[PDB]
Each structure stands twice: as C-alpha cells, then as structure tokens.
Design an enzyme around this catalytic site. Structure first.
Site, PDB file in Angstrom:
ATOM      1  N   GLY A  94       0.766  -1.231   0.000  1.00 26.73           N
ATOM      2  CA  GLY A  94       0.000   0.000   0.000  1.00 26.73           C
ATOM      3  C   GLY A  94       0.804   1.290   0.000  1.00 26.73           C
ATOM      4  O   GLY A  94       0.550   2.183  -0.803  1.00 26.73           O
ATOM      5  N   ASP A  95       1.781   1.391   0.893  1.00 27.22           N
ATOM      6  CA  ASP A  95       2.576   2.610   1.002  1.00 27.22           C
ATOM      7  C   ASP A  95       3.853   2.645   0.161  1.00 27.22           C
ATOM      8  O   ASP A  95       4.721   1.796   0.304  1.00 27.22           O
ATOM      9  CB  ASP A  95       2.912   2.841   2.476  1.00 27.22           C
ATOM     10  CG  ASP A  95       3.697   4.113   2.710  1.00 27.22           C
ATOM     11  OD1 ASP A  95       3.782   4.964   1.793  1.00 27.22           O
ATOM     12  OD2 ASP A  95       4.221   4.260   3.839  1.00 27.22           O
ATOM     13  N   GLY A 148       6.257   4.445   0.481  1.00 33.09           N
ATOM     14  CA  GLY A 148       7.380   4.581   1.386  1.00 33.09           C
ATOM     15  C   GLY A 148       7.863   3.210   1.804  1.00 33.09           C
ATOM     16  O   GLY A 148       9.035   3.024   2.129  1.00 33.09           O
ATOM     17  N   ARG A 175       2.599   9.439  -8.825  1.00 31.55           N
ATOM     18  CA  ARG A 175       1.461   9.487  -7.921  1.00 31.55           C
ATOM     19  C   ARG A 175       1.862   8.613  -6.731  1.00 31.55           C
ATOM     20  O   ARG A 175       2.981   8.742  -6.227  1.00 31.55           O
ATOM     21  CB  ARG A 175       0.199   8.941  -8.607  1.00 31.55           C
ATOM     22  CG  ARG A 175      -0.365   9.849  -9.715  1.00 31.55           C
ATOM     23  CD  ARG A 175      -1.570   9.189 -10.396  1.00 31.55           C
ATOM     24  NE  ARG A 175      -2.226  10.076 -11.355  1.00 31.55           N
ATOM     25  CZ  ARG A 175      -3.176  10.954 -11.047  1.00 31.55           C
ATOM     26  NH1 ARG A 175      -3.598  11.075  -9.793  1.00 31.55           N
ATOM     27  NH2 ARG A 175      -3.713  11.710 -11.996  1.00 31.55           N
ATOM     28  N   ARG A 190       0.022  -9.538  -2.269  1.00 28.17           N
ATOM     29  CA  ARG A 190      -0.201  -8.329  -1.500  1.00 28.17           C
ATOM     30  C   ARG A 190       0.324  -8.524  -0.091  1.00 28.17           C
ATOM     31  O   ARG A 190      -0.007  -9.502   0.575  1.00 28.17           O
ATOM     32  CB  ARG A 190      -1.685  -7.998  -1.363  1.00 28.17           C
ATOM     33  CG  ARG A 190      -1.910  -6.880  -0.354  1.00 28.17           C
ATOM     34  CD  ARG A 190      -3.283  -6.254  -0.458  1.00 28.17           C
ATOM     35  NE  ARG A 190      -3.779  -5.729   0.827  1.00 28.17           N
ATOM     36  CZ  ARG A 190      -3.197  -4.772   1.548  1.00 28.17           C
ATOM     37  NH1 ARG A 190      -2.066  -4.198   1.145  1.00 28.17           N
ATOM     38  NH2 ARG A 190      -3.768  -4.369   2.672  1.00 28.17           N
ATOM     39  N   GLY A 230       0.381  -6.326   3.294  1.00 22.99           N
ATOM     40  CA  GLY A 230      -0.021  -5.092   3.948  1.00 22.99           C
ATOM     41  C   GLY A 230      -0.369  -5.240   5.417  1.00 22.99           C
ATOM     42  O   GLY A 230       0.036  -6.195   6.077  1.00 22.99           O
ATOM     43  N   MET A 287      -8.286  -3.126   3.110  1.00 23.82           N
ATOM     44  CA  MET A 287      -8.958  -2.444   2.000  1.00 23.82           C
ATOM     45  C   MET A 287      -8.654  -2.774   0.536  1.00 23.82           C
ATOM     46  O   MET A 287      -9.143  -2.063  -0.353  1.00 23.82           O
ATOM     47  CB  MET A 287      -8.776  -0.931   2.178  1.00 23.82           C
ATOM     48  CG  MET A 287      -9.191  -0.403   3.548  1.00 23.82           C
ATOM     49  SD  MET A 287      -8.914   1.380   3.754  1.00 23.82           S
ATOM     50  CE  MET A 287      -9.881   2.073   2.379  1.00 23.82           C
ATOM     51  N   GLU A 288      -7.878  -3.816   0.245  1.00 24.75           N
ATOM     52  CA  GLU A 288      -7.590  -4.087  -1.168  1.00 24.75           C
ATOM     53  C   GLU A 288      -7.489  -5.547  -1.620  1.00 24.75           C
ATOM     54  O   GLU A 288      -7.454  -5.816  -2.822  1.00 24.75           O
ATOM     55  CB  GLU A 288      -6.288  -3.375  -1.596  1.00 24.75           C
ATOM     56  CG  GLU A 288      -6.204  -1.875  -1.292  1.00 24.75           C
ATOM     57  CD  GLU A 288      -5.731  -1.577   0.128  1.00 24.75           C
ATOM     58  OE1 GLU A 288      -5.340  -2.526   0.845  1.00 24.75           O
ATOM     59  OE2 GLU A 288      -5.740  -0.390   0.528  1.00 24.75           O
TER      60      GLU A 288
HETATM   61  O1  LIG Z   1     -11.144   9.115 -18.400  1.00 22.71           O
HETATM   62  C1  LIG Z   1     -11.048   9.089 -17.171  1.00 22.71           C
HETATM   63  N1  LIG Z   1     -11.780   8.140 -16.437  1.00 22.71           N
HETATM   64  C2  LIG Z   1     -11.749   8.017 -15.035  1.00 22.71           C
HETATM   65  N2  LIG Z   1     -10.988   8.831 -14.242  1.00 22.71           N
HETATM   66  C3  LIG Z   1     -10.245   9.790 -14.950  1.00 22.71           C
HETATM   67  C4  LIG Z   1      -9.356  10.784 -14.441  1.00 22.71           C
HETATM   68  C5  LIG Z   1      -8.919  11.134 -13.015  1.00 22.71           C
HETATM   69  N3  LIG Z   1      -7.520  10.874 -12.967  1.00 22.71           N
HETATM   70  C6  LIG Z   1      -7.190   9.810 -12.076  1.00 22.71           C
HETATM   71  C7  LIG Z   1      -6.900   8.558 -12.830  1.00 22.71           C
HETATM   72  O2  LIG Z   1      -5.815   8.818 -13.714  1.00 22.71           O
HETATM   73  C8  LIG Z   1      -8.351   9.633 -11.149  1.00 22.71           C
HETATM   74  O3  LIG Z   1      -8.059  10.431  -9.992  1.00 22.71           O
HETATM   75  C9  LIG Z   1      -9.485  10.166 -11.965  1.00 22.71           C
HETATM   76  O4  LIG Z   1     -10.433  10.837 -11.141  1.00 22.71           O
HETATM   77  C10 LIG Z   1      -8.911  11.436 -15.581  1.00 22.71           C
HETATM   78  N4  LIG Z   1      -9.398  10.986 -16.706  1.00 22.71           N
HETATM   79  C11 LIG Z   1     -10.241   9.951 -16.341  1.00 22.71           C
HETATM   80  O1  LIG Z   2      -8.378  -1.656  10.836  1.00 27.48           O
HETATM   81  C1  LIG Z   2      -8.176  -1.521   9.629  1.00 27.48           C
HETATM   82  N1  LIG Z   2      -9.271  -1.372   8.753  1.00 27.48           N
HETATM   83  C2  LIG Z   2      -9.161  -1.211   7.354  1.00 27.48           C
HETATM   84  N2  LIG Z   2      -7.956  -1.179   6.713  1.00 27.48           N
HETATM   85  C3  LIG Z   2      -6.843  -1.326   7.559  1.00 27.48           C
HETATM   86  C4  LIG Z   2      -5.453  -1.330   7.213  1.00 27.48           C
HETATM   87  C5  LIG Z   2      -4.737  -1.184   5.863  1.00 27.48           C
HETATM   88  N3  LIG Z   2      -4.032   0.059   5.960  1.00 27.48           N
HETATM   89  C6  LIG Z   2      -4.521   1.046   5.047  1.00 27.48           C
HETATM   90  C7  LIG Z   2      -5.377   2.040   5.750  1.00 27.48           C
HETATM   91  O2  LIG Z   2      -4.598   2.642   6.770  1.00 27.48           O
HETATM   92  C8  LIG Z   2      -5.293   0.332   3.981  1.00 27.48           C
HETATM   93  O3  LIG Z   2      -4.370   0.104   2.923  1.00 27.48           O
HETATM   94  C9  LIG Z   2      -5.713  -0.925   4.678  1.00 27.48           C
HETATM   95  O4  LIG Z   2      -5.711  -2.031   3.768  1.00 27.48           O
HETATM   96  C10 LIG Z   2      -4.810  -1.500   8.441  1.00 27.48           C
HETATM   97  N4  LIG Z   2      -5.605  -1.596   9.480  1.00 27.48           N
HETATM   98  C11 LIG Z   2      -6.893  -1.485   8.953  1.00 27.48           C
END
Ligand SMILES: O=c1[nH]cnc2c([C@@H]3N[C@H](CO)[C@@H](O)[C@H]3O)c[nH]c12
Ligand SMILES: O=c1[nH]cnc2c([C@@H]3N[C@H](CO)[C@@H](O)[C@H]3O)c[nH]c12
Ligand SMILES: O=c1[nH]cnc2c([C@@H]3N[C@H](CO)[C@@H](O)[C@H]3O)c[nH]c12
Ligand SMILES: O=c1[nH]cnc2c([C@@H]3N[C@H](CO)[C@@H](O)[C@H]3O)c[nH]c12
Ligand SMILES: O=c1[nH]cnc2c([C@@H]3N[C@H](CO)[C@@H](O)[C@H]3O)c[nH]c12
Ligand SMILES: O=c1[nH]cnc2c([C@@H]3N[C@H](CO)[C@@H](O)[C@H]3O)c[nH]c12
EC number: 2.4.2.1
Lengths: 243, 243, 243, 243, 243, 243
Positions: free
Chosen positions: F21-22, F24, F43, F86, F88, F181-182
């Site tokens: 996820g991060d 970092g 991003r 994944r 996380g 969350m993923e």
């Molecule tokens: O054609 C598109 N469809 C869906 N999202 C985006 C975006 C915006 N840019 C991001 C994805 O590149 C996301 O934050 C979205 O809100 C730009 N163009 C489109």
């Molecule tokens: O208690 C929790 N609920 C939902 N997501 C997370 C996470 C993970 N960390 C992120 C949100 O801080 C997100 O990527 C999620 O998958 C850690 N603890 C929890």
C-alpha cells in the site's frame, strides 16, 4: 434423539463426512469400502458409515438443490461434523479444456443460490478449506489421476428459460471451471459453522452444448471409480487426524 | 427416451400431477388409491401413476428444497403436465390461529428462493391458478374438512443463523399464514410454462417455537389422511376434465 | 374528523369500495346507479356513496400513479373499508389475444412500484382476494360478458426511455396479460391491512404498438358500460354479505 | 393533437412551466396573476396559461405521487417545456430548525420512488438546475422572504407501516431538510430531457411528530402567499430570458 | 495529535481545503501561490498550507480512488474543514461537445463507488454546495476562462472488462458531462459532515475513444494553468469569508 | 510506451510482483534485498525491481483503496504479471484471538468494494491462488514465524458513520479473521486476468476497539520484519517457477 431429516444421532456422526447428491451413489460407494454399516434412509438422505483404509467416516446423500442440501449440511455441522467433502457430477464451463469424464477439484464457488444469502451477505466468499483441497489433489496424484482445479458455479437453475439470461457465459469468461448445484452452499455453511469443506466433481456434459448432445446420462465406470477412490482416499487421510 | 431425473417418458405423464416432497409419501398415497402402476424411482424422484375415482393422474415426489423441486417441475411442465398440485407439510406463521394438524390451501406465496428469480424478475407474483385453488376448497368442504386459506412463505433456509435476521416474523405481520419450501417455485414455473398450480399443506409445528418443543416428527394421522383425501379428490376432479 | 386527502369521515366509509382512477369517471358511474350522495372532492379524490340494488358502497377516484393511489387506499383501509375493487383501463401485453375494448379480471400483479416495497419485502406476492375475483367473474358470466383472466403488470413508468429497457416485453413472455399502474399497490396494501381486494380492467391499447396507432383516447362505449355493470354488480353482491 | 393526459397541444406549452400538485391550487394562483387563460382539465391535470409581469408561462397540476407527476412531466418535457419549477408543500425532517410555514428551496433530492430508477440507474443524482435554484433564491431575497435551502427526501410512501422501517430518520441524520413526493422524479426526468428544474416547498408538519398533532391541514395563509409570489416571480424572470 | 493518514494536527487544518489526486500536483500548486508551508507527506497524502491573495488555505492530495480519498476527506471533515473543493482531471462523456483541455465545474455526481453507499442509502444524491459552485463559475468568468458545467460520473472502475458492461454509455445518454474517480465520494461525505464541496475538472481524453488514441498523458499546459487559477481564486474568496 | 499510471514498460514487468500500500514501504523493502533497480514513481505508485535469493521480481505500491489499487493491478495483469502477492496491514476481527503484531495469510475475502462488482457479479468469490497461499505458509514455517490463516473483509470504508451500520460485527460472527482495503479487489481481478494472487497481512489494531486505544500507528518492528521476509521468500520461490 435423531436429527430431523438425517434420522441418525449426534453420536453416529463422524468427524469426516463424504456427501453425494444421490442416495443411490451411497450404496454404490459403501460397497467399494472395506466394510460398511447402514445407519438410516429418510427422504433423500441416506446415511451409511464407511470403513476404508482403517478409517471411519460417514457417507450421506444430500439430494438435488441448495435448499435441500443445506438441511443436510446444517444437521451434520451442528452435530459434530468436522470435515465435509462433496463428490458429484457437474457441467463444463470451459468446453475447449474441460470435457466429459474429466475430474475437477474445486476450491471456491459462485453463490448463485438463496440459502447462503439468507445466512450471510452476498459479498462473503464461498471458499473451501485449503487442506481438504490439497489432500484431494495429493490423493489424485498418488492414484495417477489427472484432474483440473478451479471455481465452480453453484446455480439453483438447471433448466434456464428465454426471458432472464443465464449467467453461465459470464462466469465462463470469468474463468469459472464448472457448474453444479451445491458446493457454494456447502462452503458457506462450513465456514460459518467452522467445518472444513471441499469438493471433487466429474463432468457429465456442458450446458452450453446440451442442445447438441453434449450430455451423458451415465458416467464412464472407470472414471467415476477414479473420482470415488480419490474422495475415499481423502476422507480416510483427513479422518486419521481425528482418530 | 426418458426425462433426465424423473426417468419416465413424455407419454407417461398425465395432464394432472400430484407432487409431494417425500418419496415415501408417494407409496403411502398410491396404496390408498383404487390401483396404481409404479413407473420409476431415480434419486429422490418416485413416479407412480395413480388411479382414483376412475381417473388417471401421477404422484411424484420432488424432494426437499426449491432448486431440486424445480428440476422436477420443469421436466413435468415441459413434457405434458397441465396441472400440478403440491401436497406437503409446512409451519405456522400465525400460532394464535393455525396449529399443528391444521390444513391450509394456499393461492399465493413469498418467493424467498433463487430459482424463480433466475426465471423472471422478483416483482413477478408467485400465485396459484384460481380453479385449482377453488377445486381444492370444494373438496375440503364436501369431505367436511375445515381448512385455512392464505399465503405461504417459501423460504430456502430451514435452519436460520444468528447473523442475518429471518424474514418469517415480518411476513407473519404481513399476514402470511404458513411457511414451507417449494410452493412459490411451483407457482412461478407454472405461470411461465402455462401449467395450472395449487397447493395444500398440513402444519407440523411453528418455527417461532421449535426451541420450546412445538414440532411434530410425525404428522397427525387423521389430518394427514383428510388432506390426502382432499388432494386426491381435487386431482380426480381436475383430471376428469382433461380426460 | 376528516381523512387528510379524501376529506370524508370514518363513519362515511362503506365496507365495500369501488375505486377508479379518473375522478371524472366517478360521476359517470354514480349516474348509472339508482341514487347517490356526493361526499367530498379534494385534489384528485372524488368520493360518492352509491346506491345500487338496495346496497350502499363508496366510489372513490385514486388518480394516476401508485404513490398517489396508496394515499387513498391507506386512508380507506385504516378507516373501515373491508373490500376494495379497482375498475379502470389498461394496456394489452398479449396483442394477439387481448385487444382494445376487451375486459380482464386480474387475480395478481407485478410489483413494479416503490410503495409496496417500502411496505413489505419484494418477495411478497401482490395477489387479490379469491371471493372478489370469483364474484367479478360470476357477475360477468350472468351478464354474459366474455372476460379475460390473468396477471397485471403495475408499472410506475408510463413513458419509457431508451437507456433502461422496459420490462414489459419480459412480462409479456412470462404470460402477464395486461399492464396498468395501480393494481399491485392496492393488492399489497390490502393483504397488509386485511382488506379484500380485486380488479377489473378495460384495454385501451398496447404499448408495444403505440407507435402504430394502437391506442384509443376514448374507451369502447359498450365495453366500458359492461365493465361498469360487472363492477357495480360485484360491489352490490359483496356489500350485501357484509350488511 | 392534444397530449394524452394534459389534453393540451404542443403549441400551447410555454418554455417555462410552474407545476403544483393540487389542481385546485392552479385556480387559486391564476387569479393572482395579471390575467390568465384556462387551457384544459383532465383527471388531476389542470392546465392554465398565466400572465404575470408581462410574461407568459403555464401552471399545471401534477397530482399526488411520482408515477402520476411523471406522466405530466414527460408530456411537458417531450413537448416544449424548457424550465419546470415545482412549488408544493412538504414536511420537515429537521424539526428543531425548519418548522410549519417555513419555505425551502431545494437543489437536490433523494430518489425514493420507482419511475426514476426505471429511467436510469440509482447511482444517478436527482439534482435541479443551478440557475433555476439561483433565480428562486434571488426572487425570495428581493421579496425579503427568508427561506431555507436543502435536500428533499422524495418518498412514494406517505403512510408508513410497522414492518419495514421508514428511512426518514436516516435521511434526517444525513441532513436532508424536507420530505415530499415529487421533486426527485421531476429532477431526474428533467436532466434526462434537458429541461431545467427547480422546486420551492412550504412546510405543513413534521412526520416525526404527526402523532403529537404537528401537522396543518391548511398552510399558513401569508406564508403560502409569499412562496407563490417567489415562484411566479422566478417563472416570470426565466420566461423573459426564454422570450 | 496527528490525523492517522494525513499526519497533521487539527490546528493545522484551515476552514477551506483544496484537494487534488496527485501529490505531485500539490508541489506544482504551492509554487504558484504567493507563499507556502510544507506540512506533511504520508503515503499518497501530501499537505501544504497555501498563502494566496492574502488568504490562507491547505492543498492536500487524496490519491486515486474513492476509498483512498474518503480516508482523506473524513480526516479533514471531522477535524475542522468547512469547505473542500476538488480540482483534478477527468474524461469526457460528451466527445461532440467537451474536448481535451476543456474545464468543467460539476455540481453533482453519479455514485458509482461503494463508500458513499456504506455511509447512506443509494437514493441519496451526491450534490455539491451551491456557493462553491457559483464561486468557481464566477472566478472562471472573471478570468475569461470558458468552462462547461454538468454532472460527473464518479466510477471506481478505470479499466472496464468485457463481461459486465460499463455504464458510461448509459450516463452519456443520461447527459452526464464527464467522468472521474472521487467527486461523488467528496460530495456525499460532505453533505453528511456538513462540509461544503465543489469540483473543477480538466479533460484528459474520452474513455469511449481510448482505443483510437484519444488521451493525453500530460494535460494541456495553459489550460491546466487556467483551471488551477480558477481553483485558487475560488479558495481565496471562500477562505476570505471564514476569516 | 509506458503504463498510464505506473509509468513503466511492459518489458519491465516481471512474472512475479509484490504489491504493497505505502510507496514509502517499497523503499524500505528494496533495501533488505540483495540489490534493486528503481523503475519509476508516479502518484502513489512506486515501482522497483527487486533482486532476492537469485531471483528477480517487482515490488509496487498500490496506495490506499480498491479503486486506486485496481488501476495498479490492471496495468500489471494486462501486461505480463503472472503472480501478485499483496503484503499489507489489517485490523483484527477476532480481538480475543488475533492481536496487534500478529500476521495473517489470507486465501479469500469479502467483496465490500465496487470495482470487483463492476467487473463481475457479486456471487463470484474473491479467492486467492492455492500455490501462493501454500508457498506463503511454507515460507512462514521455514522461518519459524507463526501465522494465522483466514478470510479478510476488504471494505471501502475505513471510518464508519452512525446512519448505516457497519457489517464488520457480522463478518466477525461469520468467522472472517481480519479487515483491510484491497485484497478482494486483487483476487477478483486476478481470477479474471488469469493471474495468481495471494495476501499476507500484519495486524495494527482492532476496529471494534479503536475507541479504547486499540491501534498502533507504527507496526510491531520485529513482526513487520518477519512478514516481509516471508513475502520476499515466497516471491523468490514463485519466481523460480518462471525463470
Ligand atoms: O477518463 C477518465 N476516467 C476516469 N478517471 C479519470 C481521471 C482522473 N484521474 C485519475 C486517474 O488517472 C483519477 O483520480 C481520476 O479521477 C482522468 N481521466 C479519467
Ligand atoms: O483496521 C483496519 N481497517 C481497514 N484497513 C486497515 C489497514 C490497511 N491500511 C490502510 C489504511 O490505513 C489500507 O491500505 C488498509 O488495507 C490497516 N488496518 C486497517
Ligand atoms: O451441467 C450441469 N449443471 C448443473 N448441475 C449439474 C450436475 C449435478 N448433478 C445434479 C443434477 O443432475 C445436481 O446435484 C448438480 O449439482 C451435473 N451436471 C450438471
Ligand atoms: O416449519 C417449516 N419450515 C420450512 N419447511 C417446512 C416443511 C416442509 N417439509 C420439508 C422439510 O422437512 C420441506 O419440503 C418443507 O417444505 C414443514 N414444516 C416446515
Ligand atoms: O398501456 C397502458 N400502460 C400503463 N397504464 C395504462 C392505463 C391506466 N390509465 C392511467 C394512465 O392513463 C393509469 O391509471 C393506468 O393504470 C391504461 N392503459 C395503460
Ligand atoms: O410530511 C409530508 N410527507 C410527504 N409528503 C408531504 C407533502 C406533499 N403534499 C402532498 C400530500 O399531501 C404530496 O404531494 C406531498 O408531496 C406535504 N407534507 C408532506
């Protein structure tokens, strides 16, 4: 104190149980075991204690459809069952890869029933126990029996109509391997009741080509026999852990 | 050729068919007729041609659950059956009124299944044919057997859990009289396939009180006998017309 | 006190009520009765106490649309009405069998509204009362007016768009006979409020052929008259029993 | 040719239209204008061409209910209407802030109906036009009439039952300000037909406190007069723009 | 104490907050202001305090996706933010009118996400605050920067698959102007938390034509600069009031 | 050309990929490998090729949220990835058994997102690959690190509100082990794109007890370290299969 539908008692239920749809299949299976003991036969639920490779485990039929097998599973799960494996037939959803006579061991299933939904939100996954899955695969390997692995669509609708489209093609594109009618229900009940579930199926046709004759009314002995040896082999191995 | 699960022929299907859940019930019903002809017995589907009051109508068991019974109904509906009446047991959703042994003739049902939904949108009503419903009431009257009338909740879940609340209490407040597991499916399939349907049920308890012992493992003998009498009479009358 | 929208009192409500859509149709009906007594006229609701064959029963308009007619039926059901029969127009969903001028007596409907669902789960059936249905049919018989019988599609959408497809085609295939906008709501409200309901309709067109001119702005004169006779007759007969 | 329900011709429709629910309201408004022209009156739909401040625009009643007003709105949108502003009454969902007689101009709405969903997916927002909304607030300002702004819950259910909980509390927590029965429908049909929409409402009670008598059968006279002036004013301004 | 993900304290949050998706867009924005103060950078969340036109306000990145930005919006809304305006890119759903480089200020959105639904019923609208919407249009006008206005489809799916159809075509017909991934989530969380929201977007292509090369990896420079000026301008006017 | 968001070429994608996820976090991971090659950082998506135990594989950040990570997963799956694991953090749904610092390897997940439903029906299960699952478990064993196994609830809502109830308690009752969350998004996209998926997570708190201070802002160091070794070792093993 007998179970409402199984008509056996708590003490008669073993930690490992092999379930099949047809009560006739149970008769044909017990005979391939070392020895067996008939316990009961109520409605479509036939129970028989099996003995195979020094292990003890029941073989119960659950009938066609999710609602009916759920009654069976709940009664087993709420009264001692620890491992439940389903053995039956299915249709292929990948006609160019999986064909008649083939055996597939499923790890998860599509919940196209109602009972599981009345039990838990739709987002919950219908997934089997890894160990049961792994043991079924290893037994297949030891018997030098090739098998497929994948997701099964568990749909409550065998005969589709022409108003509401079937989701079978969608699921085929989604890479679901086969289609039957109970696995998903079994998996969800199992996870909710902390019971390890699994599933091994043999293909009897492909619903996409039923109109073409892609359907066997009876399975090839040799093949059905192989799937049964695998299932029995697995139950035996899984039962050893509770002996 | 035979039908996939019933294992009988298109010519063996009579315009009228009495469906029951337990295949054992078909035996107990055939003997009470003038004469009969056992046709087939596959899985949980026993088919016997009944002879009563000079008429010919089949008695077929459909097993427990909507998905499994839909298999039975589809094969009948798509192969000649013009009328199908279900006769089985149910639970009471109005305990202060309908008790064990009571009989109820239903004309509509709650579609808490999945198969009917896979057939047409849920907004579609699961309703029985008027004439069948009426014919069942006139026979109950002639035989001087008081019966109730109302909506049956057809739910795919027999054993509820503690996570997702059951809708039985809501439907009870909505004035649903009874709860069972197949009617709604029969009605919907009947309407789509243009097959007249109806249903009569005998109460075996009340799901709101199973924990307090309100349940019969065996139906009340005289009441069951009367219901079967009503059913056979109704089937005989309806069969007459088609002959 | 007065009911919020019908602006009549609880004491002014007769056990049997005839409901129509257009308030201008309530005046045309009162004039064919032996005598009448105007009660109130608020918004689209016009109430009149009709006298026919020694019987007294109200005739109230409910306006177009489920949500609006629900307000009318709720105030009637919660204040005394015991029987409510809807008489109106509808479109044919079986253009080969049911044409303009034809009359159809329905015993169930498709809940394509929102009020019923805000009141009870979508699985609950929208079905009318047996007696009411029978009564309407017998009255039609005595007058020797040939009528159809079937399910009605009660859809909140009169004018379809091109984004979300209309479900009418599906329902036509599911064997629903006609389509209007209030029957389903009446039925569910009645089943919930223990009020016997029923409905009889006259076809004014076919939504599948509107673009081909298949639609009448004015109803077939004599056919409309016959339906009104049947309706008034059934009300008279039902009001007699309650008295 | 006349519209099916409104019974007015296409060329009788002005670009701007003011819609109210009660056909009686259309009469009480037309007299408050400089002059007027009665066009037609069919069912609950009364149409009148209003003349105010040298501008021209219709005032048409839509009746109670989403399905009913949809027939009205569709006929107008598909035949000329460019702007449609609804002015009616509502209930407060914020009893401590918005009270009886208060006026609320809404920019968005909760789609608790059915027709909107039969037109486009539920995820689509029921939102009115910024300009209309803006002109309404400015006419209110020029008239020194304080008003509230917010979301209206448009629900097809007026009289709730005790089985399925009402979502009104939920929406009050979600900060919806008011509750009525037609706005959401108008907004959705409007964006789909490229017709600008808006709505102004006067509070007649709080459904959370109806049991305490928090309701007025008759709106506060002067407050009602103010809202209508704001509406007529807004209509006049926009009409000018469309001249 | 620091917010879990933003890593800033409640006292570092200003009443007005400008959110963008790309944390890199934050750095490119701060240097276009009179001055700035880096606050924090955690995961995809970069916060910096901006000083523009004698006014103070934050600019925080929220990442791609509705679930990730909700975490951002919630920490901001529950800790002081009164106004949040999103400024990002989007695709066009009206290729005959809105092209790459064009700017659109949205007042409402389609809730094709999941978070908003886990927060409030689907019928609830995703609508922005009018003042914010007006403030953006006026700044645009003052800068002589033509802009479009309309509804934005906020969809969690960027790359559609071939099994379940995309709803973009439906929404284009429904007249939605543009499509992106976080606006509707901001609006809903905003309405629930009493925070005023708005959105200004710049077109980077049209999803209906991606396969025909209609997409810009980098936004039109001058146009991106114009939009950023409209946003900063609006944030200044709004922050002014609170100060 | 480059992938739209990850900014790397198809040729730069290795058969096995470790996602987190991060961003970092990927820098903290590459440093524990034998050697590494930075590829891009756009991003919240940071991509680095990791060299470990004689094998190569990428480590990419997907950011917070299902819609955000889906963009990452799609670009990887549609361009060569064969295995995606994944690694996380997560919250515990069984506070009496699974606590902070604990590690849980998951083989399935609850689909409380939107994207997966936009790719396929809800009934489809979100299940990981068995080999991956087993490989992760085997690596855990070898390193003598005890781990839990179970279903993860992947929910798009981190901060719940008081209007719509959270489903977490339900899933806790249904036996789901943790919440993040993923994972469900990855699994579904994997099955659809024929990519093997898996997931290992470390507990940082219990959402049921956040109010009592049951949450670590910083992951247990030695435990995080142990989990990373398991993930790196698993990726190495699996990559061998594609060398
Ligand atoms: O054609 C598109 N469809 C869906 N999202 C985006 C975006 C915006 N840019 C991001 C994805 O590149 C996301 O934050 C979205 O809100 C730009 N163009 C489109
Ligand atoms: O208690 C929790 N609920 C939902 N997501 C997370 C996470 C993970 N960390 C992120 C949100 O801080 C997100 O990527 C999620 O998958 C850690 N603890 C929890
Ligand atoms: O093609 C098929 N479609 C659906 N079910 C099955 C079955 C299994 N056999 C039974 C139906 O014959 C039922 O128990 C189902 O699970 C085999 N082949 C198929
Ligand atoms: O209380 C009850 N709940 C649900 N089903 C039944 C039944 C009927 N009996 C069968 C299950 O034993 C099944 O076919 C069902 O329709 C009797 N009593 C009840
Ligand atoms: O073809 C049709 N579709 C939908 N409603 C109706 C109606 C009835 N007439 C009314 C609308 O004109 C409404 O009350 C509806 O129930 C007649 N024909 C049709
Ligand atoms: O408290 C209320 N709940 C729902 N609708 C209304 C109304 C409006 N008045 C009409 C019903 O009297 C209907 O058109 C509705 O939109 C006023 N007060 C309320």
């Amino acid at each position: 104190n007998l179970l409402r539908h199984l008509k056996i008692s708590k003490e008669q239920i073993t930690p490992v149980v092999l379930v099949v749809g047809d009560p006739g299949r149970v008769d044909k299976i017990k005979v391939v075991c070392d020895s067996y003991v008939d316990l009961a036969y109520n409605r479509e639920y036939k129970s028989v204690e099996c003995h195979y490779k020094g292990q003890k485990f029941l073989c119960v039929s659950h009938g066609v459809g999710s609602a009916g097998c759920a009654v069976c599973f709940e009664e087993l799960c709420q009264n001692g069952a620890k491992v439940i494996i389903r053995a039956g037939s299915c249709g292929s959803l990948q006609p160019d890869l999986i064909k008649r006579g083939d055996i597939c061991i499923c790890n998860a299933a599509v919940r196209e029933d109602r009972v599981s939904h009345l039990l838990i939100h739709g987002d919950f996954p219908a997934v089997g126990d890894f160990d049961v899955y792994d043991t079924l695969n290893k037994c297949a390997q030891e018997l030098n029996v090739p098998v497929f692995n994948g997701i099964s669509v568990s749909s409550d609708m065998y005969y589709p109509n022409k108003i509401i489209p079937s989701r079978l093609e969608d699921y085929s594109k989604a890479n679901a391997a086969v289609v039957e009618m109970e696995l998903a229900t079994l998996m969800v009940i199992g996870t909710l009741r902390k019971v390890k579930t699994g599933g091994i199926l043999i293909v009897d046709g492909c619903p996409f080509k039923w109109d073409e004759g892609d359907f066997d009314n009876n399975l090839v002995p040799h093949q059905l026999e192989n799937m049964i040896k695998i299932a029995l082999g697995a139950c035996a191995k899984l039962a050893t852990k509770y002996a």
